[PDB]
Amino acid sequence: GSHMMFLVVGQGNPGERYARTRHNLGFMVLDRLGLSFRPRGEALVAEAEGGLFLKPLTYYNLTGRAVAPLARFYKIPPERILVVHDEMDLPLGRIRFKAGGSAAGNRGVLSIEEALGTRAFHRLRLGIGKPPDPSRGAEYVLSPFREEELPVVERVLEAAKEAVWCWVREGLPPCAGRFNGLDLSL
């Protein structure tokens, strides 16, 4: 319709090179929802149930360029914006809803904060852990998960799919109550 009730944003980079990488977890979650995405401007967009699901094709670090004009245009309040992203500050196997707060160095979240001028939007943080040395962070997020991690990633994607629908239909607090305590690790 002419209006949108919510905006779910998956963080990722465009192209097959990135599709299995840790930094594309947000895209992977959106791709599990069973929606029909269509190219619109610099994004793939899907609709369902009165709102919008966005896989920006801006590159990860530039997603604010797409998110902010859309959210302002549709007058979407912060508690009806959900940014789904990989999170180095949580271990693989943890999933957390967060209302507002800092980006903690995540360039996608930072781009959106800078473009909107607020931190108050919601996030679904999907832990990925950290590399053994920080100097490998860039390579870590642009690499596929390890062999031994795959079963945990699968659980996380299943949980995160359900969590996205939870947030869409219920709002953040009930969903934080169901999901934030989960331990999906091996």
**CATH number of the domain enclosing 150:** 3.40.50.1470
Question: Residues 6 or more apart from 123 whose CB is under 8 A from it?
Answer: 82, 83, 84, 85, 97, 98, 109
CA-CA distance, 13 to 8, in Å (whole number)? 16
Q: Which tokens in the block code for residue 172?
A: 């953040």
CA-CA distance, 165 to 53, in Å (whole number)? 11
Amino acid at 178: R
Q: Which of 69, 90, 81, 76 is nearest to 119 (CA)?
A: 81
Number of domains in the chain: 1
Name the structure determination technique: X-ray
| Residue from 3, 23, 85, 122 carrying the catalytic annotation | 23
Binding residues: 18, 59, 61
Are 92 and 153 a contacting pair, CB within 8 Å?
yes
Q: Which of 10, 11, 25 is nearest to 143 (CA)?
A: 25
Q: Which tokens in the block code for residue 129?
A: 């852990």
Binding residues for tRNA: 18, 59, 61
Residues in the chain: 186
Q: How far lies 78's CA from each of 54, 64, 95, 100, 119, in Å?
A: 16, 14, 20, 9, 8
Q: How far lies 10's CA from each of 17, 37, 49, 126, 160, in Å?
A: 17, 12, 17, 11, 11
Q: Is the dihedral of CA 112, 113, 116, 122 positive or negative?
A: positive
Determine how many CB atoms are found less than 10 A away from the CB of residue 144: 14
| Cα 174 → chain centroid | 19
Amino acid at 114: E
Q: Per 3-state DSSP, what percentage of the chain is helix, strand, and coil (rounded to 5)?
A: 45, 20, 35
CA-CA distance, 181 to 132, in Å (whole number)? 26
Question: 162 is in which domain, residue-wise?
Answer: 1-186
CA-CA distance, 81 to 69, in Å (whole number)? 13
Question: Residues 6 or more apart from 182 whose CB is under 8 A from it?
Answer: 94, 95, 159
CA-CA distance, 28 to 22, in Å (whole number)? 10
Q: Which of 147, 127, 158, 155 is nearest to 22 (CA)?
A: 127
Q: Which of 100, 112, 123, 136 is nearest to 22 (CA)?
A: 136
Task: Sort residue 50 into left (φ over 0), alpha (ψ -120 to 50) or beta.
Answer: left
Q: Which of 110, 114, 126, 117 is nearest to 30 (CA)?
A: 126
Q: Is 23 a catalytic residue?
A: yes
Amino acid at 66: A
Q: What is the distance in angstroms between the CA of the first residue and the CA of the last residue of the chain?
A: 44
Angle at 12 between CA 68 and CA 103, to 5 degrees: 60
